[PDB]
């Protein structure tokens, strides 16, 4: 009972942080920024993906509460699709912001040709479609199964089961953890190596403070992403290789890893909007 209520409370706080942070970002964008800048467009996309991902949570919390699905087949499908789709969109929006900053720093001449709000909208739509390429198969492929005393949201298993399960898990691991980590690490490393040569940063003590501040945001963003997404993926891979007995410690660790994965999206508005110097000028 204590473990269940701990999970519920932590989950509820995560939901709250996700909903209010993202909605505040929405209100600020729609009242002050006026959606006229590429970075504001990217922040809006990130906030939308994070908001929907966090809105996926209460259905899962209720499901684990009763051990059953009370919402029906149609809801089961839309919730599963929203979860997968919005995880992918949030990760891809993080990658796109990283690449946008890399282009704005390391390729300044071409950023004149590329970094326009129309191109930001085009790449946002392209990312949404690319994530739909996995949201729709699981939308049509999610199903509701009946057990002796429980209702569970699962996925239909086209024969064989093992090949399909491995393919899905490997695809999610590669295109949701390995690729974003590599992209953001390479882009931010090159961007820092370029920013070390900017004369307005390698100057007086104030300029050195500015450079250290920029490096601090870059490194803290990378570290937050890595610490928020590595444990859950590692743990689900470990579970898939060796079966894990169901105990209190295993359950609490599993739910903490899930909560950490969602706190990634909860923290994203703090790192990308509130610490954004454009937002600080908005009074």
């Amino acid at each position: 009972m204590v473990t269940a209520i701990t999970i519920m409370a932590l989950y509820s706080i995560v939901c709250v942080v996700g909903l209010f942070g993202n909605f505040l970002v929405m209100y600020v964008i729609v009242r002050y920024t006026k959606m006229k800048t590429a970075t504001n467009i990217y922040i809006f996309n990130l906030a939308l993906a994070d908001a929907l991902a966090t809105s996926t949570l209460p259905f899962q919390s209720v499901n684990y509460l009763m051990g059953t699905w009370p919402f029906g087949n149609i809801l089961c499908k839309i919730v599963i699709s929203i979860d997968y789709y919005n995880m992918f969109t949030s990760i891809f929006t993080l990658c796109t912001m990283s690449v946008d900053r890399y282009i704005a720093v390391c390729h300044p001449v071409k950023a004149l040709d590329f970094r326009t709000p129309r191109n930001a909208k085009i790449v946002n739509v392209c990312n949404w479609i690319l994530s739909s390429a996995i949201g729709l198969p699981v939308m049509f492929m999610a199903t509701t199964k009946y057990r002796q005393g429980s209702i569970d949201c699962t996925l239909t298993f086209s024969h064989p089961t093992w090949y399909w399960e491995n393919l899905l898990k490997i695809c999610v691991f590669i295109f949701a953890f390995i690729m974003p980590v590599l992209i953001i690490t390479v882009c931010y490393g090159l961007m820092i190596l370029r920013l070390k040569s900017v004369r307005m940063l390698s100057g007086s003590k104030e300029k050195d403070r500015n450079l250290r501040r920029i490096t601090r945001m870059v490194l803290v963003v990378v570290a937050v992403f890595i610490v928020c997404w590595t444990p859950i993926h590692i743990y689900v891979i470990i579970k898939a290789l060796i079966t894990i007995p169901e105990t209190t410690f295993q359950t609490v660790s599993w739910h903490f890893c899930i909560a950490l994965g969602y706190t990634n999206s909860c923290l994203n508005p703090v790192l990308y909007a509130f610490l954004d110097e454009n937002f600080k000028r908005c009074f």
Binding site: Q60, N63, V236
Partner: peptide
Amino acid sequence: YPWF
């Protein structure tokens, strides 16, 4: 992310 995984379903429970």
